[PDB]
Amino acid sequence: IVEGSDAEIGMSPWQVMLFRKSPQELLCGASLISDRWVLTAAHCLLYPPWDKNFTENDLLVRIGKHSRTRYERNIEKISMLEKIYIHPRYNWRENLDRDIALMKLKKPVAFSDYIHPVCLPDRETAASLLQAGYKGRVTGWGNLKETGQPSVLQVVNLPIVERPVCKDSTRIRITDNMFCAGYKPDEGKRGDACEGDSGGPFVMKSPFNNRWYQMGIVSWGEGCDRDGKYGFYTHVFRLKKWIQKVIDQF
């Protein structure tokens, strides 16, 4: 996260770290959506242009964390993966359309002050909150600048951007399964996700029921925190029928 701040303890209890077993390293962010299910970006697991194709046994998820590098004894919980599910129409060839994946844990995780699931949006919450200018929150342990790494989880609040501005900022083809967020050059505030934050959550706090909803997944950007560029996020609600189908079937 660029131009963010240290998270408070328990501020993002749905935040998950995707952790490579060997070598031991941070791969991506992710989020807890129930006691057995974790949501992330498909490109965190499958990206053939970079020879990336992780299997269940390559990875762990670490839940309840604050410190990036410490083993947080008696606080964090480490889970093995039972199964990975990638969206069948995830477009890794072109523009990362439908950049979403689910991971089922081998055993349920115990909730605690530090471990708690985020809500997924219904149609009405999405329609009400996914509006240009409305701010969400991005969290992660990724790099602090494009060109370094944080001691603890970082947090930044960023406004959703009008779709024409998103499209006009890039040569990539933008789809309805994406939205973008960030400040404009003239707005005098800054901030972005960066390398290692992808797969983590973009959340909004509903003013109707005071619950946190995951509206986006950190998906892609051109650099980090560049003027006139924006971060792009998987539109969770647009893909919720697939989420529901996976959880119902499996």
Binding site: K21, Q24, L60, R62, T69, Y71
Partner: peptide, 11 residues
């Protein structure tokens, strides 16, 4: 710079 995690999670 990661602290080693317990071996049980790697078995």
């Amino acid at each position: 710079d990661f602290e080693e995690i317990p071996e049980e999670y790697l078995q």
